[PDB]
Amino acid sequence: RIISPEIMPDNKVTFRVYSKDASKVTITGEWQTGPGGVEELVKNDTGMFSITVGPLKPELYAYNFTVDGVKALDANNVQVRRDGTNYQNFFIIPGPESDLYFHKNNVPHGTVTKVWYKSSVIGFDRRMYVYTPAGYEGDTQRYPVFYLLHGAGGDEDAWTNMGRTAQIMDNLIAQGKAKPMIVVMTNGNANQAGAQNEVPPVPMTGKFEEHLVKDVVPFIEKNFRALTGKDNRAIAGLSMGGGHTQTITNDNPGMFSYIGVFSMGIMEKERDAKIEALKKSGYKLYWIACGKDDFVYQSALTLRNTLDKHNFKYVYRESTGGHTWANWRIYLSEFAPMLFK
Amino acid sequence: RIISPEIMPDNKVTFRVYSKDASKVTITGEWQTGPGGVEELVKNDTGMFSITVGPLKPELYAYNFTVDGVKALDANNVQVRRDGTNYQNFFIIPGPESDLYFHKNNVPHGTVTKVWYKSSVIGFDRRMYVYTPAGYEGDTQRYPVFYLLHGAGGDEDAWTNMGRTAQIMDNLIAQGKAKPMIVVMTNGNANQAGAQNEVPPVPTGKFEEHLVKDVVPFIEKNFRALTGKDNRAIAGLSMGGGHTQTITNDNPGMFSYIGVFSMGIMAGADAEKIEKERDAKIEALKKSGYKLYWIACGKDDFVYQSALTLRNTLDKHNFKYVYRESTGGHTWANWRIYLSEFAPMLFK
Numbered sequence: 080r081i082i083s084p085e086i087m088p089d090n091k092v093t094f095r096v097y098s099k100d101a102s103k104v105t106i107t108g109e110w111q112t113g114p115g116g117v118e119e120l121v122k123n124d125t126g127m128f129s130i131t132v133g134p135l136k137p138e139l140y141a142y143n144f145t146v147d148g149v150k151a152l153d154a155n156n157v158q159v160r161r162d163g164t165n166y167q168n169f170f171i172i173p174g175p176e177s178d179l180y181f182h183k184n185n186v187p188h189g190t191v192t193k194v195w196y197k198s199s200v201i202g203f204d205r206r207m208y209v210y211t212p213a214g215y216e217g218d219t220q221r222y223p224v225f226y227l228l229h230g231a232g233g234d235e236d237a238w239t240n241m242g243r244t245a246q247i248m249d250n251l252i253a254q255g256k257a258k259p260m261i262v263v264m265t266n267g268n269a270n271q272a273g274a275q276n277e278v279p280p281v282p283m284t285g286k287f288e289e290h291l292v293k294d295v296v297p298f299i300e301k302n303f304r305a306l307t308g309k310d311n312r313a314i315a316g317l318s319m320g321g322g323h324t325q326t327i328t329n330d331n332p333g334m335f336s337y338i339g340v341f342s343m344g345i346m347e348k349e350r351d352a353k354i355e356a357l358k359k360s361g362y363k364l365y366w367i368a369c370g371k372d373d374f375v376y377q378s379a380l381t382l383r384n385t386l387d388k389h390n391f392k393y394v395y396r397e398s399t400g401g402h403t404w405a406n407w408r409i410y411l412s413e414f415a416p417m418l419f420k
Numbered sequence: 421r422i423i424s425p426e427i428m429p430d431n432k433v434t435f436r437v438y439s440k441d442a443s444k445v446t447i448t449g450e451w452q453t454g455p456g457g458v459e460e461l462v463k464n465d466t467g468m469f470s471i472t473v474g475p476l477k478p479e480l481y482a483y484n485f486t487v488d489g490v491k492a493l494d495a496n497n498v499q500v501r502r503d504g505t506n507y508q509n510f511f512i513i514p515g516p517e518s519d520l521y522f523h524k525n526n527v528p529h530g531t532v533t534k535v536w537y538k539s540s541v542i543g544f545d546r547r548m549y550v551y552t553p554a555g556y557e558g559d560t561q562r563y564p565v566f567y568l569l570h571g572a573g574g575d576e577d578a579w580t581n582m583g584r585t586a587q588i589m590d591n592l593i594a595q596g597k598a599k600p601m602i603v604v605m606t607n608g609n610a611n612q613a614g615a616q617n618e619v620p621p622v623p624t625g626k627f628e629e630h631l632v633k634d635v636v637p638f639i640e641k642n643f644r645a646l647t648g649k650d651n652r653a654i655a656g657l658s659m660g661g662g663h664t665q666t667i668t669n670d671n672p673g674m675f676s677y678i679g680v681f682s683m684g685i686m687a688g689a690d691a692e693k694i695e696k697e698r699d700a701k702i703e704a705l706k707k708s709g710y711k712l713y714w715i716a717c718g719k720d721d722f723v724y725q726s727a728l729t730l731r732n733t734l735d736k737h738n739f740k741y742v743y744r745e746s747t748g749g750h751t752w753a754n755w756r757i758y759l760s761e762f763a764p765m766l767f768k
């Protein structure tokens with residue numbers, strides 16, 4: 080039996096790959112410096128390649144191997160994630176910064192529902208994922224709703240798979256840090272019916288955004304025990320989805336009171352008029368989060384300046400790092416506790 | 421820029437792996453006969469390894485590569501399944517025998533819900549998957565319920581992932597071949613809270629007792645379920661076919677449609693006393709008003725003789741069943757076939 084990864088008491092991590100045939104086995108992982116920082120495993124006489132890295136800071140880290148030039152996952156690690164077409168293994172180093180990302184056996188767990196709905200706007204049925212809080216079943220309580228949008232290359236599975244949304248929400252809700260809430264994760268690619276690993280291509284500017292308001296929101300409010308109205312609605316998205324969030328809220332002032340723009344910036348006289356209408360809409364939070372090293376940083380500054388021009392109040396969270404799921408998990412973790420308060 | 425697998429118009433399939441630095445790439449796949457059936461890809465002078473196999477009969481086939489002694493999936497194939505800890509790619513050769521396994525864009529799709537429930541019997545909360553038929557949302561109709569159980573090594577994700585349950589049910593229901601129904605896929609491992617790829621380990625007869633005392637009431641409370649035996653079906657494969665027998669034998673009159681896939685006689689205590697209890701349970705079930713007892717098994721399965729022993733014992737009791745013998749053995753290919761044939765029989 081081969082243990083890989085093996086997390087040590089000092090948060091070093093050992094990885095192992097067996098092969099007497101292979102010449103070179105490397106590992107690519109999210110703790111590394113960059114492409115030049117790929118690391119080579121050391122082969123012993125027995126055929127075992129191994130490497131120990133770290134100590135690593137608490138976080139979720141994805142990785143894979145490369146065996147004589149071919150990508151290979153870690154067959155001894157059952158934890159596998161998917162980012163579009165890119166599959167990688169992962170592990171989580173325990174500690175304060177990663178604690179919300181674990182699936183804990185002593186925490187009540189919310190349901191994840193993969194549900195299809197008709198779309199009058201797009202013209203074919205589409206799939207979304209809906210998280211409901213623990214204890215939703217068997218009760219009559221109604222809950223506010225948070226619409227959570229992915230970026231380019233993603234799909235309705237991404238926020239749970241890459242973003243650990245079910246764990247983050249289970250843990251925040253159980254800890255009393257976020258209110259119980261329904262989280263709705265749409266597929267933001269209007270040409271798709273659902274995630275490409277399960278749903279084939281179907282045999283469009285503005286259509287996703289229009290469909291969220293005209294098709295998704297009514298379906299959620301009809302088919303789930305949802306509170307209604309702007310103070311019970313939140314919306315956030317990353318990158319492309321942060322653009323969707325702006326378009327949706329700019330075009331529908333007074334529909335969402337909690338608005339989050341993750342790793343995205345600006346995308347006219349119409350623009351200024353829509354800011355003025357949104358400014359007067361009674362919103363409660365406009366939260367902009369971006370990493371200092373993200374290529375979109377300057378565009379996010381332009382967004383902030385454009386809001387400043389209108390004396391439009393927002394909160395800005397600048398973080399370390401760049402355009403990564405590590406940052407998007409952090410942003411979700413910080414934004415969800417702000418909602419519906 | 422690399423297509424792999426490339427399914428050709430004649431149902432041959434080409435696989436490709438690129439690396440100038442690799443020495444040997446082989447492929448392991450379900451069209452092969454045994455471990456000595458692994459096949460070597462041929463390397464061209466530009467670093468592309470390739471092989472063309474087939475023609476293959478219509479079916480879903482899983483596969484992976486081995487690169488210089490290390491398992492590797494096909495990075496150009498987004499279709500990946502999981503059997504416990506074993507991940508493999510797959511593809512589906514179109515044709516009559518595989519058509520139900522495709523996700524079709526012109527077919528209404530049922531919801532798959534991953535829901536947690538308290539278990540008084542097991543003592544901690546557990547996860548199951550529930551399929552509801554297309555159009556469940558937004559309507560008031562109630563639906564009969566089919567409990568579908570996996571075997572050893574599986575979990576509540578297996579029947580949808582390995583078994584293509586959502587596609588089979590969507591397609592059968594849309595074609596009018598099976599009635600709209602709720603399909604409940606439990607985790608049959610009483611020591612687990614949920615599937616090992618998502619849920620960590622937790623700090624007998626318990627599964628079977630919990631299905632009746634915890635799962636069924638939760639489904640009937642929280643889903644729009646018709647109830648009573650004529651609205652209730654249960655089937656399972658291997659270990660889950662054993663669970664199916666134990667549950668139905670211990671609760672005669674609770675299920676009208678019973679499916680035993682790739683499983684035979686249950687082990688028991690003296691040999692005679694076991695047979696007396698077994699006889700009594702057969703007789704009570706015989707008189708229970710059930711509608712269908714369906715036994716399906718591959719002729720090459722190790723369990724074949726035990727399933728024959730079961731059939732012979734039922735014959736001795738004049739207990740009416742239907743037997744479906746198939747080609748092949750103890751495989752998800754057969755379990756998909758069995759689901760595809762059993763679901764159209766239910767609730768009619």
Ligand SMILES: O[C@@H]1[C@@H](O)[C@H](O[C@@H]2CO[C@@H](O)[C@H](O)[C@H]2O)OC[C@H]1O
Pocket residue numbers: 162229230231232233318402403
């Ligand atoms: O899930 C997607 C991420 O994978 C994507 O990340 C970008 C991918 O291309 C690289 O060149 C960029 O550096 C990297 O940020 O971001 C969008 C998200 O939807």
Ligand SMILES: O[C@@H]1[C@@H](O)[C@H](O)OC[C@H]1O
Pocket residue numbers: 503570571572573574658750
């Ligand atoms: O891998 C198979 C498993 O999925 C099933 O549960 O029992 C038989 C095994 O061969």
